[PDB]
Amino acid sequence: QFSDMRISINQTPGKSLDFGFTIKWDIPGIFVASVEAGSPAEFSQLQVDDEIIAINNTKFSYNDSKEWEEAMAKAQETGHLVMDVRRYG
Ligand code: NI
Ligand code: NI
Numbered sequence: 001q002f003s004d005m006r007i008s009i010n011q012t013p014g015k016s017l018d019f020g021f022t023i024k025w026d027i028p029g030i031f032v033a034s035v036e037a038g039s040p041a042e043f044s045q046l047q048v049d050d051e052i053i054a055i056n057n058t059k060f061s062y063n064d065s066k067e068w069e070e071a072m073a074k075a076q077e078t079g080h081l082v083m084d085v086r087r088y089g
Contacts, residue, residue, distance in 0.1 A: 001089045004053075006082060009044040013079040021046055028062040032085075051086040059084075 009019050020039020024031040032050045035041050052060060058071035075081040 002086050003089065004084065004086050006084055007044050007046050007050075009040050009046065009081040009083065011040045011079045014077055015079060018076060019081055023052065030060055030068075046083065046085070047087065049088065051088070052083060053086055054084040056080070056082055 011017070011019060020036040020041035022033045024033035030052045032046055032048050032052065035046050035048055054060060055071055055075055058067060060068055
């Protein structure tokens with residue numbers, strides 16, 4: 001009932017605004033908590049409750065949230081976020 005998919009989100013490199021979504025930490029997983037109207041994440045059609053599996057070259061693991069957070073900050077710097085998510089039906 002779940003589908004794996006890849007979602008590409010892009011904005012100006014080094015922008016002062018984030019991509020438009022917040023994360024719900026529900027260890028051992030992380031999920032999309034909110035997607036803001038008007039944002040790059042809404043344009044790209046990321047959805048609330050999508051499970052976040054990886055961003056760019058970083059697979060999430062409950063064992064290293066530090067590297068996760070560093071990968072998220074780096075994607076804000078480059079403006080490119082290719083997300084592997086699992087969407088439950
Ligand atoms: Ni929910
Ligand atoms: Ni670029």
